[PDB]
Amino acid sequence: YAVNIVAALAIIIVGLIIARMISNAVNRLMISRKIDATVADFLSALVRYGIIAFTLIAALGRVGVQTASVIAVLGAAGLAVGLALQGSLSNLAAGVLLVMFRPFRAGEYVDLGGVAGTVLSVQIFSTTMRTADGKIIVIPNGKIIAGNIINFSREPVRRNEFIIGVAYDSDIDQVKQILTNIIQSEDRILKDREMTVRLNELGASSINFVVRVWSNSGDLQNVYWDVLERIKREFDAAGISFPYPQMDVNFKRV
Amino acid sequence: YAVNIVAALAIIIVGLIIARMISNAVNRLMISRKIDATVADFLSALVRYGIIAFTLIAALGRVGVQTASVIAVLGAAGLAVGLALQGSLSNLAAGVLLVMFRPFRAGEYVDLGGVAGTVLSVQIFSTTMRTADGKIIVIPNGKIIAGNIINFSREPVRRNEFIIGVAYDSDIDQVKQILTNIIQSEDRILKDREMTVRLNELGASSINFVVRVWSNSGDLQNVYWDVLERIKREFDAAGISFPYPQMDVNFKRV
Amino acid sequence: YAVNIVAALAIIIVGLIIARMISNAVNRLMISRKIDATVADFLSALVRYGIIAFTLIAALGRVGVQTASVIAVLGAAGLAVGLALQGSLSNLAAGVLLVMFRPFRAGEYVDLGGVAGTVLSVQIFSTTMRTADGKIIVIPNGKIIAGNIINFSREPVRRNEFIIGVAYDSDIDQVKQILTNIIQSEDRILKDREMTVRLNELGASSINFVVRVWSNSGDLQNVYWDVLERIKREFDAAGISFPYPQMDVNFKRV
Amino acid sequence: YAVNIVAALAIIIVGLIIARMISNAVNRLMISRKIDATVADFLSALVRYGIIAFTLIAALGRVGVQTASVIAVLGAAGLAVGLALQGSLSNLAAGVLLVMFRPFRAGEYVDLGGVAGTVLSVQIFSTTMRTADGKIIVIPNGKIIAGNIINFSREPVRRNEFIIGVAYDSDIDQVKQILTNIIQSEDRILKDREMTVRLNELGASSINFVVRVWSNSGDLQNVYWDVLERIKREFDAAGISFPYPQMDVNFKRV
Amino acid sequence: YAVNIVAALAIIIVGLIIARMISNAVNRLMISRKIDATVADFLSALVRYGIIAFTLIAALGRVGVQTASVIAVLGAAGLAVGLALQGSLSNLAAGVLLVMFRPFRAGEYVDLGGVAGTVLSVQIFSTTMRTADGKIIVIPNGKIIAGNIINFSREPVRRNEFIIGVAYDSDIDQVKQILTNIIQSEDRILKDREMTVRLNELGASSINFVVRVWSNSGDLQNVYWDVLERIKREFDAAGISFPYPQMDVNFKRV
Amino acid sequence: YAVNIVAALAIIIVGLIIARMISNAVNRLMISRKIDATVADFLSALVRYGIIAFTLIAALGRVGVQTASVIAVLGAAGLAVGLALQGSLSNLAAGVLLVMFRPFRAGEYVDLGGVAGTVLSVQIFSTTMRTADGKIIVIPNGKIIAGNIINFSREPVRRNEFIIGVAYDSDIDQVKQILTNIIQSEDRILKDREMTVRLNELGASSINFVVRVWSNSGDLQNVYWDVLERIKREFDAAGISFPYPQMDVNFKRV
Amino acid sequence: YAVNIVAALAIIIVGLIIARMISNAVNRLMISRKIDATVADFLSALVRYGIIAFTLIAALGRVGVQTASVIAVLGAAGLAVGLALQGSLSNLAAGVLLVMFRPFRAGEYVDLGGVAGTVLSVQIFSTTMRTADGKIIVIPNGKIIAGNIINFSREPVRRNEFIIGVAYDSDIDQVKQILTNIIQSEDRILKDREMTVRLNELGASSINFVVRVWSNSGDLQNVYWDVLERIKREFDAAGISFPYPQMDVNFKRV
């Protein structure tokens, strides 16, 4: 009736003292194999939890009598292990596809669903990637093949999207002529591709022209800065005013 | 009692040294089959993890005695493999439906739930698609048949939705006449379909007319830019003022 | 010990060369059955992956010896296939209910949880629907019976919800009389149903009347535009001013 | 070795031609049973997919030899069917509880987690409900017993929550007296219940009184409109000003 | 070969006609047991779906021959039933814990993760709760023990959090003295507990004092209204001005 | 054929009448064991649902004949029970770790992923915690070890983060000197740790200094109030102005 | 018929009294093993719930007769235990990978998907991490390898991203010269890396220059404060004005 219960708890007691013994043993073979002062404690806790799990399945093998009282609960605690290693091993199967079917390698400035940065290394569970401002990010591989791996450095040619808000009173032909003269004077702009400068929308306080300019991927930010400084200089020189947010106030003196 | 445990750990030690041996062997047959310097290390780590899994199931086959002590935990670790390959192989089954039941092919400017761009290629796990500004995006196929695959280039005819905010004091008939004259003068607009220019809402600072204009899919952005530049020119010529955000300030001199 | 491993890897090598052979064979029977230049490569990759899976289960049938070493891992990789075809075949079972228990058919301007448009066709995995501006959207059927399928063209009669912001100094009886005269003069408004014009809330810069007007589903947008243009014309004629966003500025000259 | 594979593919070919034959047969018994021109094609595709599934399980019964090679993959593809009919049949089990344990019936203006409207009918997979502006919404029953089914017409008595922003310089006793006189003069307000008119918060541009008024569920919107029009009329008559958004501008002449 | 298929479909035909017969039979014993005109149709549809499921498992028992062709697919469709009754019966197991381990009973004004209201009754699948404005909400119990069940009426003593924005030029000692005099003059405030009136932050347009005042749970809103009306009256009497949103405008006459 | 069905339904009828009998019996032994008037009804409904489940499995044991017709559906309805007790018993396993591996005990003012308050008691399914304003919150333990359990009272020393916006025309050395004099004059500030007062950002209308001041956890809010009142007093005394939101208005008289 | 039911309930009664006995016994061996006054009650409740589960499975072993009536429901309640220990033990398997495959150790100021702080310790279920303002956060490890573990202190070199809004009338060469002189005069800036000072965008009220400056990770905030104070001082000295939010007001005197 209960003699199997009290015997099983006695086996759990000897399982705890042998958990202490094999934790010291795994620390000994850890310092025999490769020295690390803090992971030997967690390896000891892992083999301790495993051996009290083995003492647990021996315990309910002793107490349970009917036909499969140990077998069902053993496959049960194993299914707990299985759903536990769902996310921790799906990163492994994702890391298989990340290099065998590689959408990026170590060196392309990529963007892994949100954060962006050049990949330092694709490891077997993580992707250590230096972001644009030095913060090393590692990302679990089950999140990389969950979202869009938007690469940048795979295509050598990219496109700049300027938006230059000018005032309503400015002549459209003068602004389009000066903008096309600017994007024609710059030699880093690829002149074969789409160079569109036209009126994009009529916003609240201003109109604003889209200037879509293609360039190589390496000179992209340099073009985006140089053309914009050129736009500011030429628009200040040519009298085409940049507008502050306008407002039409109607007075009412009470 | 514990002699099966210490024998099982000895088998794990010979499993580690044979993991080293078969990692060198799989590197040798990798450079025999097809050369790649970095995936042979990860293939070696994969076969290493697999063979310590085989040593693990041999270990708990040695230690576990009862009826199915190896079988339940083996189906367990296999179910861990199964839930791990849930997301990594659902992309494969999605990539079956993506081409056998194809909603898009390589060349249509499409939008895969968020990001948008022409598809370069539909591979077996990803869809490499060049976005509109050169950033190559790959997307896992389990996300494509999770969201709306909103195509653009499947229908040859699309619709432009202008909104032109004009002032309250402007005559409605003059604005509607000039807008219909503009969308009638343009020949790229398909004159058979819906050409609606009517007062859409009365906003806070302005009224604004919706101009729904259909066109071919190739000339869509060119129509949206040319008609809008025409609207700005004709409204500046005809004296119909574009309004800045109005405000009715009531004074109070203390 | 390891002779089963090296024999199993040899079987994987002959599985790779017969994967090449049956990929050429499935390309041959594909061009025999129905010509498509790009799906025969992906069908070849599918039968290639299937036959290396069969070589894999033969491999661990050779290496595994105990009782069910092939059977547990075979049901495992099959359960990987099963969870992979969870989402890819739930669209099929949803597409059964979408037409057998049909909430919409090809032609009703519907809204499938977010995006909206007339359905071109309900296929067996997708619903190709032209949106209101020409973008063909296909939607996986497992998302349609996940969200609200808000139909519009099933009920022939719908309701317009005007909100007309007028100034605080305007007389309420004059605005209600002119609005009821407008919605009574229009004959496309169904005069039997709810025609409510009353003061809805007192906003910050204005008061605003709700004008709830029912109409047929086909004339709905035409009524919403014509009544609103009538409201603008009659309110400009009757002197009831439309207010810009007011503000009460208290001065303080330092 | 491979003779079972090529024989299995031959059986798949006769399964395809008998899929065509039984698709014509199910179309024939469909026009014998009940005529519908488009669902017979999808019923034909369903029985076609089912019979190639039966040919598939016969195929891997032929090729697989060991002990349970057909049985594990058959329970696998069945588990794919099971997880596919997870969401498609949970709506059925929800529709059981929706009427056996009914929180609403056809006629109460209810709100099913987001969208709101009177229920036209509670079907076995959906709840066709007319919203307040004519758009017929059907909602899958697995979403109704996922969220709060906030009923309105179950309780006959509801409460109006007015917020009337008045200026800071207004006398509090005059506003409270006029508001209580208004909510006492109206006879549709239930005088037994909570009639609270007190200063609720001191906002940025104004103070604002909460007027909590109970009424019957049928006269609720009529009370909310009539009392608010009464508030506007009496506050314009009594000189208690309604404030526009105030601002305290401190000058600085450079 | 196919004689089992055509015999199985014949059994499905007699299953459909006996589904009609037992639907009439369950309607007869429903009007024998307890009368309800609309749930007998859905009970008839439920027993109809169950008996075509039994005809289906008899059908694939006839067609499937090998070893467990009926057993695997029967446990499969049962697992479909099981995952279907996941959410529909987890509400039952939550409703066990909701009353055996009760965090609230019928009468405490509680807040069940979002919406808030006094509980009318805790049923076995739902919690009918009247919200503060009469809308009866029922909530599935699997959502209550998913989120925070933030009770209010379990603790008899609660705390009011006033924030009174006053101008920068006001003396801090005068405001703190008048506020402490107000919260000392009110007798419904519990004088033993935390009565903190101090400067909380320096906002953009004003400074604002936090007045944390404890009271009984029944008099909480009455204290929050009475103390605030007292604050408005005493601050208008004592000359401490309430500030409108300030702004420091620097002129520039072009 | 159907005699097992009608006999099974007869057994369901005697299961319903014995469900009534054992519901009265469990009410009798409930008032024998421990009196509670409302949970005996729900315990009666629970044992009623359990015994109609036993009558159901006896029913499909009678009707089902083949090999495991009762066994598969019994493990099925049990798996429904299992997924039902997923969330209702994961709180138990979380409550094990919450006290055996305790990150907080009854008395530390903690924050359990969102809401914050001192823990009154950690029960076996919930954590009754009084929030800072008296609202007793209970939280299911499966949500506590889902989110960050951000403790406050575990570390005795915390840090105040002042932000004091001053005008652009103010001298930086005077503000830094007065702020360091204030945070040096206060003795509750721990003078050993980080006392940083430097210019943090240049906002739109003002500059603003961060004043990071460490203190004990008990005196934290008292320091944050006293230092801020000291800042207001000393800045009003020293002529360093606090700025309202500035604006640079450029006139245009039409 | 029912004698097994009443005998099973009698066994549940002796299971309750032996639950009391073994709860006292586990309290006795708890004070024998290691003293803790409150976890012995919860350990007693855990062994109480376990032993009524054993009495429950003995009860339905007595009542259920057919073939596997105890076995299916026992694997069922065990699967309830398994899905309960899904989330509570996935933290363990995540904590294995967190230290064996370590992306951070105790001491690096890291950011675990949202909240950020230096890790005090990585325990076996949680990561106690002191945030930047003293609030000790523990985080379950199943959430760490769900999101991006964005480290900061792994890379020794990071980057500051200044944005300095200056007025439109300011000369671009003067601002770029003064900014480069400032970031060249500071010696803590790493002069080898990217020192970009160029015009970044033309905002509404101002233009604004990005100043991207790299530095060591320890001096990062000190550089960000010192360079910004230098920017304020040098821009006030050199006459380059900092702009308040501009506005272009057009008058209209009614």
TrEMBL record, chains A, B, C, D, E, F, G:
What Gene Ontology cellular-component terms does the record carry?
plasma membrane
Q: What domain of life is recorded for the organism?
A: Bacteria
Query: How far does the signal peptide extend, from start to end residue?
Result: none
Q: Which InterPro entries match?
A: LSM_dom_sf, MS_channel_1st, MS_channel_C, MSC_TM_helix, MscS_archaea/bacteria_type, MscS_beta-dom_sf, MscS_channel_2nd, MscS_channel_C_sf
| Mechanosensitive ion channel MscS domain boundaries | 88-154
> Sorted alphabetically, which keywords does the UniProt record give?
Cell inner membrane, Cell membrane, Ion channel, Ion transport, Membrane, Transmembrane, Transmembrane helix, Transport
Q: What does this protein do?
A: Mechanosensitive channel that participates in the regulation of osmotic pressure changes within the cell, opening in response to stretch forces in the membrane lipid bilayer, without the need for other proteins. Contributes to normal resistance to hypoosmotic shock. Forms an ion channel of 1.0 nanosiemens conductance with a slight preference for anions. The channel is sensitive to voltage; as the membrane is depolarized, less tension is required to open the channel and vice versa. The channel is characterized by short bursts of activity that last for a few seconds.
The family note in this entry says: Belongs to the MscS (TC 1.A.23) family.
- From the Swiss-Prot or TrEMBL record, give the protein name: Small-conductance mechanosensitive channel
Originating species: Escherichia coli
Gene expressing this chain:
mscS
